Design a protein around this ligand. Structure first.
Ligand SMILES: *[C@](O)(C(=O)N1CCC1)[C@H](C[C@@H]1CCCNC1=O)NC(=O)[C@@H]1[C@@H]2[C@H](CN1C(=O)[C@@H](NC(=O)C(F)(F)F)C(C)(C)C)C2(C)C
Ligand SMILES: *[C@](O)(C(=O)N1CCC1)[C@H](C[C@@H]1CCCNC1=O)NC(=O)[C@@H]1[C@@H]2[C@H](CN1C(=O)[C@@H](NC(=O)C(F)(F)F)C(C)(C)C)C2(C)C
Lengths: 306, 306
C-alpha cells in the first residue's frame, strides 16, 4: 500500500548525458548512437539571447567550436545541423550505453520523469505533467538546459521533453526531441507568459481511484451524475472537459474498484462544490492532477522495466 | 526556480538489483561485489511467517536452495550466512557494476531515495524521510521486499534501508544493510503498530527557506522568538524540539536568505497557531517536513553526482 509521486528509474538516461560547450555557454546534451542533441541556444552568448538569429550564428561555427565531454572523454564533433530549436552534433563515437529509444511528442495531461542535469551530470529525478497550458512545474536552475524528460516502457526509453527555459511563476518550457516547443513559446529572452492553466480532470479521477485502492474512501457519495451535468460543474472550477475516451481509459480502475466512472464523477462534483473540510486524500489537502490512469495502474500493480 | 521532491539518480543502484528465490518465496536482493544481501524471510513460506525460527529454518537450507538471477543470468551461491534480519549469499561472480558504496545507519529526520523493485527489476524511484517513529511513508506492494534506500555523495552510494514490511496505516518498516531494524519492529507477522509520529521541525524550517528562495515570502512576519519559547509552542503541535545543532545546520540557508533562524522560527510559530488561511507554500496546503536542510541546499544550488 501507499501512493507516492514516483519517477522512472533513470539509469538508461544517465548513460546518455553529456556536457556541451560552445564559447562560454555550457549546457547538457543527449548522446544517442553517434548524435548529440542539445538546445540550439548553446551557440548564443547571454547578449545574443534577447533576439538571436540562430541560422546566422550557426553559419559562423565550425565542428571544432563544440566541445562535447562524456565524463573524462572529449567526443570529437564531425558534423552539425539544426532541427527546429535543437542542435544535432554528429560525433565520431557511438554511445555504447545507448538504450532502445524513441522520440515521442506527448499530449497535454500526460506525465514523464525529468532527469535534472548540470554540466552533463545528473542531480536528481522527478515526475512532471505536461500541463494543459504546455508548461511543466519543474525544478531547474541555470545550467539545467538540455536536461530531458522521458517515459520507460519495458526496455524502451521514450524521450518526450528537452528543457529550454523558465517563465514567470517559475514554470518551465521546452521542446520535443525534434526541437518543436510545447505551447506557443519561442527560444528568445523576451516577455512570454503561460496561458491560464486548467486542472486535468481525468487525472484527478485516476487519483481518487488510487485513494480508494489504498483504503481512503471517505469522499465516496451514494449518488451518480451524467457526463453532461458533470462537465458543466467542471467548467466552473476550471477543470478540463471529461470525454468518453477519458471514461474508457478509466475503465481498468473502475473495474478493479467496482466504482463506475460516473459515480466517481459525482463524488468529485461534491468535493469541488463543498471543499474537503480540512480532510486529506492520500496525505494531500488539495486534489492532485499529475497522476495519469496509467501511472496509478503501474504503481498499484507493480509494473517494472527491463 | 521551482522546488520538487527529487530522488537521487538511480542508475548505480539499478545495476545491483537481483531476484532471490527460495522455495516459492521470491523477493529482491542487492548484489555488491560477490555478496547478495536480502531479507532473511526469503527462507519462509507464508505459514512460517507468523512466528519463524530463522536460525532453525536456515540450518535446513543448502547453497543450491537459493536461486539468484541477475536478468538472464543465474548466479551460483557458494556460501550463506545470516546477520541480524539480513541474509548474505556469497556468489561465484563479483558484480562488475558494483559502485563505490558504504552501509550507513541513518538518523530519524534524514531523507533517502527508494528504488522500488519487483522480481529484481526496478519499478520507480522516490524520496522518503526516516520518520521520528522509525517508519517511512512509502509505496510498496507484495514483491517489493529487498528494495533498498540510499543517498548518493559524488560517486559513492550510501545504502541505508532495506524494505521488509508494512504496518497499519500503510506505512513501511525495514532494516539497515547490517539487518538491524529501524524502530522496535520485528520480522514476524503479528500485530505491530507505529508509535505516534512527530513533525520534523528542522526540515519544516528548511522548506520555509526553500519557499523564500523561490520567492514565496507571504508568511514572513516582522518578529523574532527565543529558542525556548519556540520549543514550547512546537511541543503542543507535536513538533520535535529544535536543538542548537539544528540551528547551526540551518546556518547556510539563513546566511543565503539573510533571515535569522530564530526569525524564521517566529514565522513558523504564527503558521502553527493561525493556520495558512487557505494559502499555499510552494504549491502545498500543509507544512512539509521531508526536506532536510541539505536537500534544500542541493536542490537550490544544483549539486550533482559522478
Ligand atoms: C538554460 O539556457 C541554461 O540552463 N543554460 C544556458 C547556459 C546554461 C536556461 C535555464 C533557465 C535559467 C534560469 C533558471 N531556470 C531555467 O530553466 N534557459 C534560459 O536562460 C532561457 C534561454 C534564454 C532566456 N531563457 C529563460 O529561461 C528566460 N525566460 C524568458 O525570457 C521568458 F520570459 F521568456 F520566459 C529567463 C532567463 C528570464 C528565466 C532562452 C529562452 C534562449
Ligand atoms: C515482503 O516480504 C515481500 O514483498 N515479499 C515476500 C515475497 C515478496 C512483504 C512486503 C509487504 C506486503 C504487503 C504490501 N507491502 C509490503 O511492504 N513483507 C511482508 O509480507 C512482511 C513479512 C511478514 C509479514 N509482513 C508484513 O508486512 C505484514 N505486516 C505485519 O505483520 C505487521 F503488522 F507487523 F506490520 C502484512 C503482510 C500484514 C502487511 C514479515 C514481517 C516477515
Amino acid at each position: 500500500s501507499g501512493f507516492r509521486k514516483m519517477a522512472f528509474p533513470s539509469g538508461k538516461v544517465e548513460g546518455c548525458m553529456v556536457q556541451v560547450t560552445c564559447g562560454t555557454t555550457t549546457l547538457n546534451g543527449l548522446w544517442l548512437d553517434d548524435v548529440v542533441y542539445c538546445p540550439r541556444h548553446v551557440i548564443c552568448t547571454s547578449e545574443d539571447m534577447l533576439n538571436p538569429n540562430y541560422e546566422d550564428l550557426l553559419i559562423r561555427k565550425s565542428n571544432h567550436n563544440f566541445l562535447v565531454q562524456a565524463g573524462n572523454v572529449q567526443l570529437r564533433v564531425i558534423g552539425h545541423s539544426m532541427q527546429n530549436c535543437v542542435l544535432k552534433l554528429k560525433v565520431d563515437t557511438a554511445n555504447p550505453k545507448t538504450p532502445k529509444y524513441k522520440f515521442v511528442r506527448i499530449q497535454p495531461g500526460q506525465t514523464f520523469s525529468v532527469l535534472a542535469c548540470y554540466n552533463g551530470s545528473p542531480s536528481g529525478v522527478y515526475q512532471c505533467a505536461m500541463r494543459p497550458n504546455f508548461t511543466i512545474k519543474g525544478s531547474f536552475l541555470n545550467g539545467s538546459c538540455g536536461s530531458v524528460g522521458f517515459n520507460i516502457d519495458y526496455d524502451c526509453v521514450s524521450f518526450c521533453y528537452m528543457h529550454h527555459m523558465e517563465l514567470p511563476t517559475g514554470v518551465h518550457a521546452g521542446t520535443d526531441l525534434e526541437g518543436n516547443f510545447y505551447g506557443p513559446f519561442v527560444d528568445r529572452q523576451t516577455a512570454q507568459a503561460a496561458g491560464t492553466d486548467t486542472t486535468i480532470t481525468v487525472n484527478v479521477l485516476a487519483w481518487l481511484y488510487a485513494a480508494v485502492i489504498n483504503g481512503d474512501r471517505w469522499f465516496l457519495n451514494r449518488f451518480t451524475t451524467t457526463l453532461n451535468d458533470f462537465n458543466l460543474v467542471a467548467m466552473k472550477y476550471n477543470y478540463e472537459p471529461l470525454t468518453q475516451d477519458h471514461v474508457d481509459i478509466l475503465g481498468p480502475l473502475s473495474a478493479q474498484t467496482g466504482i463506475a466512472v460516473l459515480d466517481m464523477c459525482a463524488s468529485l462534483k461534491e468535493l469541488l462544490q463543498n471543499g474537503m473540510n480540512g480532510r486529506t486524500i492520500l496525505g494531500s489537502a488539495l486534489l492532485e492532477d499529475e497522476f495519469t490512469p496509467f501511472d496509478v495502474v503501474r504503481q498499484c500493480s507493480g509494473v517494472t522495466f527491463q
